[PDB]
Amino acid sequence: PIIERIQAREILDSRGNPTVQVEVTTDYEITGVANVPSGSREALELRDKGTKYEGNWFGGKGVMTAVDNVNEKIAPELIGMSVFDQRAIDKLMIELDGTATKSKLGANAILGVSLAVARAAATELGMPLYRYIGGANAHTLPLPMLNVLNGGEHASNTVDFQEFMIMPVGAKSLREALQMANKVFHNLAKLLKKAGYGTQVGDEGGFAPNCKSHEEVLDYLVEAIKVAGYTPATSGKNAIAIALDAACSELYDENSKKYTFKKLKQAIAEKRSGFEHLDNVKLEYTTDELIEYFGKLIDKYPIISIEDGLAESDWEGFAKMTAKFGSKVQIVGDDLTVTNPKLLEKAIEQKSMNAILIKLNQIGSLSETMDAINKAQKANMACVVSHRSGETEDTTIADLAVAFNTGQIKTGSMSRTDRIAKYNRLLVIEEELGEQSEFEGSKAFYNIK
Amino acid sequence: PIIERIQAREILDSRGNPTVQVEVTTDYEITGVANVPSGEALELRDKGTKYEGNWFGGKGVMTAVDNVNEKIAPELIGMSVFDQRAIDKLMIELDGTATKSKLGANAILGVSLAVARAAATELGMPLYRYIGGANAHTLPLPMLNVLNGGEHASNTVDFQEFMIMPVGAKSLREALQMANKVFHNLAKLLKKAGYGTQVGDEGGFAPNCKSHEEVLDYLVEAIKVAGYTPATSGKNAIAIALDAACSELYDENSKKYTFKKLKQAIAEKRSGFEHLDNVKLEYTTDELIEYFGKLIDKYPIISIEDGLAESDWEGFAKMTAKFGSKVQIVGDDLTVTNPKLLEKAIEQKSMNAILIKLNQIGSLSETMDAINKAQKANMACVVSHRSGETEDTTIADLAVAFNTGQIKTGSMSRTDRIAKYNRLLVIEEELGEQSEFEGSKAFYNIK
Amino acid sequence: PIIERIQAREILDSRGNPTVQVEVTTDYEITGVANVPSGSREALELRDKGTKYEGNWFGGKGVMTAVDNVNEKIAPELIGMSVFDQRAIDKLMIELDGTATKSKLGANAILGVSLAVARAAATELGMPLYRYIGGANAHTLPLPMLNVLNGGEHASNTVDFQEFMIMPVGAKSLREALQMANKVFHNLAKLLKKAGYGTQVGDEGGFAPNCKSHEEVLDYLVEAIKVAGYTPATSGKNAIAIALDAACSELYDENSKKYTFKKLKQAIAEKRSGFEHLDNVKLEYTTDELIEYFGKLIDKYPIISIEDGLAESDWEGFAKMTAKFGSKVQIVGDDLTVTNPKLLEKAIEQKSMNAILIKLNQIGSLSETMDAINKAQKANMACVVSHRSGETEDTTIADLAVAFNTGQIKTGSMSRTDRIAKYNRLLVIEEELGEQSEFEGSKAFYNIK
Amino acid sequence: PIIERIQAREILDSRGNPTVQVEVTTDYEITGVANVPSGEALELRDKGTKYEGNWFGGKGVMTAVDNVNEKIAPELIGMSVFDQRAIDKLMIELDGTATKSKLGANAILGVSLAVARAAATELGMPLYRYIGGANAHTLPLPMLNVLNGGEHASNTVDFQEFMIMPVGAKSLREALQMANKVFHNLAKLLKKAGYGTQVGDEGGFAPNCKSHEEVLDYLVEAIKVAGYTPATSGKNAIAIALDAACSELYDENSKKYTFKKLKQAIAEKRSGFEHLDNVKLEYTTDELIEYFGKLIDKYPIISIEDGLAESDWEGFAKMTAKFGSKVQIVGDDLTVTNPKLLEKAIEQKSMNAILIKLNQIGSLSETMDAINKAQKANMACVVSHRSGETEDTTIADLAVAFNTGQIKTGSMSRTDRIAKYNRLLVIEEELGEQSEFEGSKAFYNIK
DSSP: BBBEEEEEEEEEEEEEEEEEEEOOOOTTEEEEEEEEOOOOOOOOOOOOTTTGGGGGSSSGGGOHHHHHHHIIIIIIHTSHHHHHHOOHHHHHHHHOOOOOTTTTTTTTHHHHHHHHHHHHHHHHHHHHHHHHHTTOOOOOEEEEEEEEOOOOOOOOSSSSSSSEEEOOEEEEEHHHHHHHHHHHHHHHHHHHHHOOOOBBBOTTSOOOOOOOOOHHHHHHHHHHHHHHOEEEESTTTEEEEEEEEOOGGGGGTTTTTEOHHHHHHHHHHHHHHTTOOOOOOOOEEHHHHHHHHHHHHHHHEEEEEEOOOTTTHHHHHHHHHHHHHHTTSSSSSSHHHTOHHHHHHHHHHHHHOSEEEOOHHHHOHHHHHHHHHHHHTTOOOEEEEEESSBSOOOOOOHHHHHHHOOOEOOOOOOSSHHHHHHHHHHHHHHHHGGGGEOSSSSSOOOOOO | BBEEEEEEEEETTSSOEEEEEEEEETTTSEEEEEEOOOOOOOOOTTTTTTTTGGSSSGOOOOHHHHHIIIIHHHHTSBBBTTOOOHHHHHHHHHSSSOTTTTTOOHHHHHHHHHHHHHHHHHTOOHHHHHHHHHOOOOEEEEOEEEEOOOOTOOOSSSEEEEEEEEETOOHHHHHHHHHHHHHHHHHHHHTTTTOOOOBBBBSOOOOOOSSSHHHHHHHHHHHHHHHHHSSSSSEEEEEEEEEEGGGGGGEEETEEEEEEHHHHHHHOOOOTTTTOTOOOEEEOOOHHHHOOOHHHSOOOOOOOOOSTTTTTTHHHHHHHHHHHHSSSSETTTTTTTHHHHHHHHHHHHHSSEEEHHHHHHHHHHHHHHHHHHHHHHOEEEEOOOOSSSOOOOHHHHHHHTTTOOEOOOOOSOHHHHHHHHHHHHHHHHHGGGOOOOOOGGTTOOOO | BBBEEEEEEEEETTSSEEEEEEEEEEEEEEEEEOOOBBBOSSOOOOOTTSSTTGGSSGOOOOOHHHIIIIIIIIIIOOOOOOOTEEEEEEHHHHHHHHHTTTTTOOOOHHHHHHHHHHHHHHHHOOHHHHHHHHHHOOOOEEEEOOOEEOOOTTTTSSSOEEEEEEOTTTTHHHHHHHHHHHHHHHHHHHHHHHHHHHOOOOTTOBBOOOOOSSSHHHHHHHHHHHHHHHHHHSTTEEEEEEEEEEOGGGGTTTTEEEEEOOOHHHHHHOOOOOOOOOTTOOEEEEEHHHHHHHHHHHHHHEEEEESSSOOOTTTTHHHHHHHHHHTEEEEEEEEETTOOOHHHHHHHHHHHEEEEOOOOOHOHHHHHHHHHHHHHHHOOOOEEOOOOOOOOOHHHHHHHHTOOOOOEEEEESSOSSSHHHHHHHHHHHHHGGGOOEOSSGGGOTTTTT | OOOEEEEEEEOOOSSOOEEEEEEETTSSEEEEEEEEEEOOOOOOOTTTTTGGHHHHHHHOOOOHHHIIIIHHHHTTTTOOOOOOOHHHHHHHHHHOTOOTTOOOHHHHHHHHHHHHHHHHHHOOOOOOOOOOTTOOOEEEEOEEEEESSSTTTTSSOOEEEEEOTTTTSSSSHHHHHHHHHHHHHHHHHHHHHTOOOOOOOTTBBBBOOHHHHHHHHHHHHHHHHTEEEEESSSSTTEEEEOOOGGGGGGGGGEEEOOHHHHHHHTTTEEETOOOOOOOOEEEOOHHHHHHHHHHHHHHHHHEEEEEEETTTTTHHHHHHHTTTTTTEEETTTTTTTOHHHHHHHHHHTTOOOEEEEEHHHHHHHHHHHHHHHHHHTTTTTEEOOBOOSSOHHHHHHHHHHHHHHHEEEEOOHHHHHHHHHHHHHHHHHHHHOEEEEEEHHHOTTTO
């Protein structure tokens, strides 16, 4: 159990940019290896711009500074500690850095060590990582929300919301959930190709076809669900629901306090070819008008969850949206809370939301992540354990979702191994648990009043 | 060392379709796990079975999974995990067909690779050392498929893969830095031109360019903007490799090769394709060879894969005779990792390199035999991914095991490709000063 | 795996002269033992002439200086290293010596350590040495070429070429190959005795009868093959072929650029008793005339391989011989290349030959030997792994030939344990592989265009 | 310690003929391997069996190999590898014949020795300590057969072995240095005289000398040129030992000993044999004893083996009575390592030393009994090779195990001989200052 060696190295993530890998070796010659994902009160990832390492990689995105911090600063302080004292190791690193955002050592240096220690501990015990993290009753597979159609910034279409996801609520196992999602995904590809749209994929394995509006995108999701043989609905036999990430911080103007469907507005202003039947669509929204817009979408489509429906500074708007729709619809904070302990405490106090996205590398240590999950769950919030845009072959978030029986995960569309590797890990966990496992579709939403 | 348990299960590949994973457990409670890729030996899927409805298109592999658990595993329990060749022979004979069509190539390869991984782990030895011995030490020069055309792409680019090869690198780490800088500068160039930069199965871009030459011109421009020199050798050099995939363009009755997608766009008078009515679209074998000669003269092309169709043996031999002292000529569809076709290619001097795809032959022992034979014939072995990959990184250890000098495992995005590059980075670090990276000297096959 | 002790000692070789043995012991108390064989760009073996050890043994041939170099200079640098890092250990020794020919420490000091390390590593893993060196597909037994009739310098007969070998190409296993060679060897002894010739043996276990010409020697080989029940031929059922080592550096004059059959010429000049029917035989040859002489022998006899048909300085001659005969006959470099990396690169570039003899102690380390085999095989050359005149009970070259599936070995006639021990090791390897083994007779020559 | 597996196989000896190797594996996965030499207990070969055609002359031993694997091994699995005497007794009784003619002496000895080697290795103990106990420490004085005659040699030298014995050495290492210097100087002398220096089965020379005296004169000259003194004791002394092998020269009906090869050369008036018509060629027992007396007076002869024929018991007793207080008298053919013949020789004072050949009696336990008995009778035990040897070095450990003081294992060339000297060098190094080498005091049997 005693840490004998800690070695960090620079590897690459799924977008082709550098990230940190750490290997921890114990005195029993057992090793744990972990990688750090990559995507402003959040913990600071350290890159090589402004150092002698800047030219190694495009955009100065090397992480050799963080790698050096692990090998030269963190590792000498931890050699000799028990690999099982997760909270003590994380506290030591937090205090060694000494800043609120982990800006001296780098959140990516600290998290890499934090996760590699936990993996080494679990391997030394011969215990599944989800049991090491969550204990003897870690047994519930998560309902996935899969980002199969894409808009927002980074997408050249005029779809201003960012993520349009399916959630196979009618499934009775994780394996069945993935079968349902597989059939919807490949039928969606076939519908888009037949319509003349492209079916190459974005960072998370989903499509960004040149659709003109939110409603066109949602209409494709409903049609793909039906053609696959399923029912668009938020509960029931054979049901598949829809989840959104509106990412509305990207659409908001803090001075006007208006939200704008920016790319669609620009296309209409340019009098672009196919955009005249959308000439009198509303493009600019107060907070209350946008909540009304979400209410209309909720009426029309089987929407079960909406993430970042308002901007990260619109605390009053979030609490109004949660008061109005939260007895029927999950309201998730992402940019609102950035996995930050103090913002989670405020969201609980103000009833800003009823679910939180959990991003390990936004807070920077496993212990702090466990504290956040414990606190949110006790506040009747759902914890949606999340990937980042830049992922790796590391599957820790699969074990993390089972460890705390979270009931939900957001880890990508049905393509790219940076996403699919997590689903494979969940398939293996479900097999190993056997009849000890549980899966809730509709009943996963214990947070919906 | 004694095999105690073999368990197959159904997982998913990088295209969202099912594939096989196998876990082998020894005597000593050591386990090896391996996954099977998917793109000649037959991969068995679930159409026509009780399992057909499980997944889109009937693409489940539970029939193959059952074949591992119920047919193969009882025959192997009790054998030593170190007798790789004896285990592979037993499975080959249990199936009893040339194409492994009874058990499935995906059932057999899954077990083959999981046994080898279990053996290496039980010995405490890196997989490349277990497979290739004490002198497994040479990191491969990667060819990265950053621009895409062919049958699966919506553009009019009829050839399939346009790759960069960073021949000027002095390490695998430097090779990936060079490729990273070209890839991200390429994306910037394409976006500024109004093309899209979503990616295909292998992590590369399929922009709506109008011709092979336009695609090649973007690679040269991205190489230069990234600070490197477009060249087949020398300091700071980055070269180009092609997969023409010309079986897809060939008509076996007319004996012509057609740039089909471009021909169709021009015919329907698609917008932005004016002034192309004089472009040559139809080539005999000899005309197409002269067309490759034109590209070789103009661009820093170091390798061409499947420049002719899988039936055009006479054409391959002519191409290799004409260009093979300066350009690598790779068979893919020509040989499909098949022992009798490799023998034919050696005897006829059809090519001077071969693509190595484990799941096209179906066992590790037969793949090792093929590599031994091809290297002894002065051919390069380009160890290859498939379009459907997983998080398994066996092909990285295989390329180092036989000091192959070359690998083809994807563009610079998607973890189904990047995981292999990460494994190579780890191998190079582990070897330290014992490692070698040969660069332009990797091409020992070029006369 | 950690090296804990290295001990060199002086032993004796099969000619009765000293050589080096090294024993490596790991921290698991596993030991590997290796011996160095003994036979000018080749690596330098260090002997005791000119030291206080010169009088220990005849001719100053002691190796205690090299033994001291192992125990006092090499061993302290390697204690603590992993026995599995073969390339790093060999590089350390090469750099410690610092000269191109290993002249400071001695090639025999360096190789002894190099081989003992590899044997210790393989034993610690419980792995056969051929699998440790060559990996999981090391499985092909070599076709042996056996030196059963002898001439050259060292032989008192008037046979000027050096080695006249049989190669049992029709065999389907190594065991069958040795049975074929056994029957030919003992029938040859019986033919020579019946003719009045002696049947004592030379260094490699073969006979040097008082034959008068190359043709008389070849005629005996053909007759022994026939009387044994086999067919003199380069391929086919029951075939036994002939291989030559002409050792023509010994016959060449660099100033006249002529090759001379020296001992036969001298006998004819002296008008010796039985040498008048050979009065108008040609004795002096240009390079082209000697190639013509080899062409006549190839026409008349089942010659499948010719080693050192031209002198080590006759690069143009070698490439002419390989161009003329290399699509039918193996052309082997021995003195031409002396297992030297730079001379191998030149032979590949100039197409000087299509096979190379591999002598571990001519280059001086296992890592360099593996590099040479890798490079030659990739250049479509055969690697004939070779003994030296002075051998020991060490059988490393048997495992080396299987490790790289070389297909050929040259390790002596069918007598003397310095040769037979290698054949016994090959018999044990073939038994242990079982049906996993391969043996090619004719098809071993993948290098013959 | 429990025997788990016994495997015999067919290997080759130093003359190119088949012999037996046996591998014994214990409980603890420890293995011992032993080989059987070949030149009284019967060695079983393959004439008359299905295996006869495998090797020249029908000399295969697969019948003996099958006897180990199929008959002996099942009887021994489960016994303790340390009970050497019980294992040897079981095999002796399973065979049930005096000469081991049912299983073969080569089957039984192979197992006997492999068991002992496995036991020693499992204990971590040197083989000489396992066989002989804590006081096994004395390196033997070697007698080296550097000049050769007799039945298997083409010269006219009728006696068989002319050996040097470096009695002046103070260590085994020094003994081998002395022998090395004599051997290579002998070769130089023979070559300068126009004789050949190829070697026989035991690594020595059979030059075409004309008489025993000419051979002895070359040994004396080589000793002197090498810098040593021809003498039976003293500093820098090197002595001579003979094997006359006089059974080969004897006619049991006439009771004469004939120098047959010389007699024939002289009769056919061979060239270079003139002026020899008066040489004595035919000897009674008493005349031959007087002839040995002549040689003993002239040359530094310290030992004579088989000076009379195996049937000439009365002659041996006369020779030993006459010369035995100054010269060792060794039985070889007289006793063939046979317990009843050794008893007869002790009772009749036929000799004062015995050659010990493991495979002539057929088991390690019976050989140990014979050595115990002979040493207690004040006889030297000269542990001996056979003409057909292998890389096995058991006889080196056997000579140290019983502190025999003497070994006969070949000239100074051929690894079938030199391997034994190398093992002795290693033993002497391992013992360090605990070792002893006795030199002229090795001859505790000489009154």
